[model samples]
Every structure is written in C-alpha cells, then in structure tokens.
Target chain A: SNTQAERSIIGMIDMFHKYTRRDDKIDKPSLLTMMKENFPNFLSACDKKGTNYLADVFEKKDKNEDKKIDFSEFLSLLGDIATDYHKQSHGAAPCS
Target chain B: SNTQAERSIIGMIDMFHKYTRRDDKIDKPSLLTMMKENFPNFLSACDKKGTNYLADVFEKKDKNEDKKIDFSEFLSLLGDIATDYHKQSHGAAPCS
Candidate 1:
C-alpha cells in the first residue's frame, strides 16, 4: 500500500499534467523540463501575488541550492498550488 | 482577517470554474448545475478509484443527504480533487 504522502505526490503529478497539459504535447522528460522552467516563477508569482502563510511556506521550501527547484523539489510544490489558488479567488482575504 | 478556510473555499471555486470553463460555452449558473450533476460521481469515482484516505474524505464530504453535492459542498471538495489527481497519475498508488 502506498503511503498517503506517496499517493499525494503522484496525484499532484497528474494534476499538474492536466493543468499544464504537458503530457498531451510533451514527454515526461519534456514535461519535467517545462515544470522546472515555469514552476519556480509560478510559485514565486503566486506567493508574491498575495500574502498567505501557506504561500510563505511554499516560497521557503520549494527551493534548492542555486535556488532552483528540480523534479524532487517539484513534487513537494504541488500542495502549495492547491492552497494558493484557494487564497487568490476567495476574496475574503484582502489583496496584498 | 480572511482565514485559510475562507481562501480555500474561494480557491476551490475558481479552480472548479476553470476546469468547467464557464463563459466559453457554459455560464457560471450552468456550470454549477453541471457540477451538481457530475461532481458526486466524479469525487466518488476518484475516491473508489483507489483506497486512498483523502479519496475517502472526498467521497463522504462532497455530498448531501440526497447524496447530491451542492455548490457550497462542492467547494469543500476542491482540496481533495488536487490531491486525488496527484495520487492517481503518479503511478505509485494502488489500482483500487
């Protein structure tokens, strides 16, 4: 049985694949490459776009030396995407 | 102060709306109706798709007494959608 964390990681991969539609056009290697290119800025942009505790956590953790996120780092980043989208559209929160 | 819950709810709405893609062919009202129709099964399908716990919460909570999911109930369900998608596509979890 896969642990929740392991399943969550896989689920995140699928979710990003759906959103990015990378699988439709690109192979796994290419998708990973695009993810590496876009996800850093995507995470940063969303984090800086608003002020939320979750976003801060994401901004801090989703980085490695040279401050870039690789595939392993990318797996960890999925949780934040769901959280940030929640923050931005909720309007209950004040704009930062 | 908008709490995490509040932002999460709003984010769920936007994320679902994006997936449903209203104003392209369907409107918000129509999309919500479709969600009412599809989401229960969609959530259940994902949950039962695997024995995952997050999937289980999704199955139970994303429903009403009629066992039908309404818009508000639908919002609570978003966190799991991201999670389930992450779980299913990564090839690490069980077939269920």
Candidate 2:
C-alpha cells in the first residue's frame, strides 16, 4: 500500500470503519446513512422516483442475516458499485 | 458518483480500465506490475509496517485460470485489500 491507489483504498475502508460499532458492524440506519451520503447520485435518483434502494440493498447485501452490516458485507456492496462503474467505463447504458 | 467515496470508486475503476486491454481485461504481467507498484507492502510481505498480505494475488484472483484479470476478478482482489484495511482500522496489529 504505497501508491495513490492504495491510499484511496485505505481511505475507503477507514470511512466504513468510522461508522462501525464496537462489534465491528454498522446498524441498518447507519448503513443507510452511509448509502445516502456516500452515494448521493443514486439516492437522489431513487428519491426522485419515490423509491428507496438503500433498504433493498441492505436487505440483499447483508447476506449473513446478522441484522447489521459488517465490513465484509459493506465491501461487497462497494464491489457492486465498482461493478456499475466498471460497466459505464465500457459505455454500457445505466440500469433500467 | 457524488462524494469523495463514489468519485474515488469511479476513479479507481477508471485507473483499472486505463490498464485494461480492448477486451476490458488486464493481463497477468500488467496486473503483477499493478500489484507490485500499487500494493508494494502486500507484494513485499517481509517487513512489519507493511508485510506481505498476499503470497500471489495474481494466482489468487485469476480464478478461472484465464491468465488475465476481469473487472469482477479485480473487484474480488480489492475486497481482500479492504478486509486487510478493516483489520488495520481495528488497530490490533499487522501480521501480513
């Protein structure tokens, strides 16, 4: 971890940890806050459409059924966000 | 695509695509270069401050034996890196 790439990645997980509890997990509302703040575009778009993707995302992403989103689970969500970015990089249209 | 986190994610994916081939995949040597350059600590794996976290990230990531890294595969690698950072953020100690 010695380059901008590493630095950026370090900053990423650290933010997630900042929202974590002593049990190393984030509650549903806290994770939703993260989703809203960290993903402004997505949240606003969903807001405009009278939808709440954050809740659905939390439901699906918290695959461990542990009631809280752990670091790994949050990273998994980040992977999907990266996936969307990956798709757009290839000039794919946004999801319908 | 709103805050620093989303922009950083987008930027990271842009960096990934920058190194990708026409097929939107990164070759092994190219990925190894990225590993060595971006993840020097993990690649070096000897020192304590930044020890070797992965013995061979390339081998571990190229799951299908494709000899190259796809976006999803690279995301998987990033997940591990995030996990390492998660532990670091916990401030216990460094092992790898």
Task: Quantify all predictions' global Cα lDDT against the true fold.
Answer: 0.44, 0.76
Candidate 2: residue A29 lDDT (0-100) = 89
- Lowest lDDT block of 10, candidate 1 chain B: B19-28
TM-score of chain A of each: 0.30, 0.83
DockQ (Cα-based) per candidate? Answer: 0.08, 0.70
Compare the candidates by lDDT and give the number of the best one. 2
Model 2 chain B: lowest-lDDT 10 consecutive positions: B45-54
Off by over 4 Å in 1: A1-36, A39-87, A90-96, B1-12, B15-59, B62-76, B82-87, B90-95
Residue B55 displacement (Å), model 1:
12
Q: Candidate 1 lDDT, tens digit per residue, A3-85?
A: 33234334445544543433332333444454444444443454565643332443464465433443344444444454445
lDDT of 1 by residue, B1-81 (tens): 433333433444554565444322233354445444445444355456554343244346545554344444544444445
